[model samples]
Target: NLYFQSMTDLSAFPITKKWPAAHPERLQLYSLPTPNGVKVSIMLEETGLPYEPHLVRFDTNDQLTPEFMSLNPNNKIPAIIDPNGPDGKPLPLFESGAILIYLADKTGQLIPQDAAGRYEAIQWVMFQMGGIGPMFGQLGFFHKFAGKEYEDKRPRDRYVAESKRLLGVLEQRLEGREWILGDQYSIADIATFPWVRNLIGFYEAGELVAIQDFPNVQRALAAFVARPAVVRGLDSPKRG
Candidate 1:
């Protein structure tokens, strides 16, 4: 039997009740451990934000269910409800990059406040959202999924080339810096690292794209993964 909890209890959002109830004061995160999902979870861990992760099982299509859609209209993973938001209102937010920005603003830790630094940080975050994420996703599909069956290597090569180009851009950006936004470890680094890690690790395209050619990217990714917060975030929603 599915036991239902009451919304008035603050711990009763059906999403949580359907899963496992977590601390009521913490932010509620509905997500999987995918690249996009890891981005926000890593930010939350880095910022030391109290959050409860409710597993969104793709096999069951939980992301498309009405319960999940109530939090995210687009029916995607990595959505959150911050009980304390602008003007102390509960804010429901989607989009992994946007969530990183919101958390940065709320915590004032990951992003710089200066005019130039702030814009530069956000600019790189935009670059990841608009550039790296989409390109790498296609590379994953073509190199690893259904696109692998097609005889046309043109489309796959196109995505691989673009992915390599973006990785080179990141390698250059991290030339002397420890993180993406220079001295400050901002949302841009948080937003881009997981996908980069996935591209090289999970996608098994490291040698395909000649990842060793980008020494700076390798250095930054190694540093990024070494963080304790990243270690914890990567293991979130532990499966039995």
Candidate 2:
């Protein structure tokens, strides 16, 4: 952690050796266009952060390579290196949840300024990270991906039930409010919505989850997708 202070050169990061940052001065985004991957890009777009995006191809197992692993041991799709970090040092970060918080804090743009409201914003982001993301992802797996091969429908229905409940929670919160944190669109909505969009779109679970039941969520999703930044970010680091 303390080593980042001494390491200011972008090239010092091994991941750059493979990806090679074309704009070393700007923030470097190594990611795909998956739900989690899009969160960072969407935030960067929403914040108007000067960043250079690099496509990390899952087809080539790019994330498992030594260069990529050196940056994020977890081998996740989205990771970033900020050349201008705290105290003007380079910062390497992984995990979409942490990345969103970092960007919000850095720009003071997407999060609530008040302490309690900021925590409340984080609370909803965590709800997506812990509940919606995982449940919706599993629902995707069982409903559309490899898990669909399993003859037993039990696993699929389990996620379906949980996803519906999670949507219910979101729907209730969004009864009159527009975004997840209400009137103001914050990182919480940014952290979520992508997954909700994926659940119905890519995962093709709209019918299974009975998306019609959550009109509030559906309405918000429509608004979220309409954002210019979101439209651009959704396909960011465009597939190679």
Candidate 3:
């Protein structure tokens, strides 16, 4: 049988009925508390949207199960089902960046509405999606995972160099700016900060990549973490 753990049932929801069934009107999130997952959760917390987060267990291969596959064919965490989407239809969305944009547009917050500013904001998000995210992911693999097995220091060095380069770009962009898009904190920062935080925090590669070199990136990350929304987001589906 396809078994699932209900985040609320552990305490908040009930044992009589399923956990997610408690708030059918709100957005339903199936995700782990990873960087990608944090992006959507942070957006929801920031927007003050009523939503239910379901804990998808990687240990049990719950992501590959039929039920989750029904929501996200790719069987990925951080997927959402919004019953109140366009035309009042249920919309299933994946991809961290896409979800961030969707929430920004839905709540009419974070992202700029103007022609030029919106596009510029999107441009920075693209940089994170293509450059920073991938580069840091590789850095994590090499510096913290099986990739470290390879005796050739070159591969790890390459990813570390690329990660530093991406951090440099972020540092340059963050210069003289409070957020990725300036004055307004846009989805760009939301999409980028969590991953950067993970790379340095969880992956423990701060010194390897010289994280202190990217003062602006670190500054933006600190500022992002200080926000009330970020605090709430980090504690979603609260742990015991």
Candidate 4:
């Protein structure tokens, strides 16, 4: 603890004031277990990195605090501080997609090392961040949340249609492949599957979106959840 503490001065960061690092030497991960949040948590677990997780309680709006906002002005969960970062300086980062890439590169574990394969993996990760996450979130809001009470069903229907289409794309990509990168369990699989799990499970939009149509997507999601890291990550920063 002494050696690692001396390596990085975490007290210099305001976020630590609110959620002080018990192990200043390890990476600091501020997050909950939402789909986006678990992406980083699962990545950390899979990489077997030493990290400290702080529960960012949305009920109390902890993310809006000055200390938390100091790390991510965007006010998102799954932000991190690597005590040992590039060039040996502590690095603060946000955005689940970017954090996934950072952790992948840092560990050299989950990403493809080859040029073409790496980019292909990144392309799928982008596909999740841009298409699956947003559309599925909207569908959740309209189909299962407050918007469910709305008299007009157009908004809900739109997201349902879009989510189904995105699932179709993923289904095709997964055909005859063990992972998004085909036999390589890369960051792209880590990035995408959680959202699919949430869309059907948490959101309860499976029947609405006709999830059965995408057998490959379902098959991959089952494999994703069965991973020991994914299981642990799904409940990380255990809420009070």
- Per-residue lDDT tens digits for candidate 2, residues 1-240, read 665544346878999999987788899999999999999999999999999999998889999999999999998879999998988788999999999999999989999999999999999999999999999999988888854359998999999999999999999999989888878999999989999999999999999988999999989999999999999999899884
Q: Number of clashing residue pairs in every model?
A: 0, 0, 0, 0
What is the per-residue lDDT of model 3 for residues 1-240, given as tens digits with 9 covering 90 to 100? 259733422222221122344666778777777778888899999889888888777888878776677667887878887767888666778888888888888878889998898788788878888887888988888888854358887878999889888888888988999888888888898889998889999999899888889888888899899999988887765544
Full candidate order by TM-score, most accurate first:
4, 2, 1, 3
Superior candidate under lDDT, 1 versus 3: 1
lDDT, candidate 3, residue 5?
34
Cα lDDT of model 3 overall? 0.80
| Cα-based lDDT at residue 28, candidate 3 | 79
The lDDT of model 1 is: 0.84
Score residue 223 of candidate 4 by CA lDDT: 93
Q: What C-alpha RMSD separates each model from the true structure?
A: 4.2, 3.4, 6.3, 2.1
lDDT of 4 by residue, 1-240 (tens): 855544457887999999988888899999999999999999999999999899999889999999999999989898999999999889999999999999999979899998888898889899999998999999999888864359898888999899999999999999999998899898899889999999999999999988889999889999999999999989888886
TM-score of each: 0.91, 0.95, 0.88, 0.96
Quick one: best lDDT, which candidate? 2
Please list the residue runs of candidate 1 whose C-alpha ends up more than 4 Å from where it truly belongs after superposition. 1-21
Q: How far is candidate 3 from the true structure (C-alpha RMSD, Å)?
A: 6.3
Task: Write out the backbone clash pairs for model 2.
Answer: none
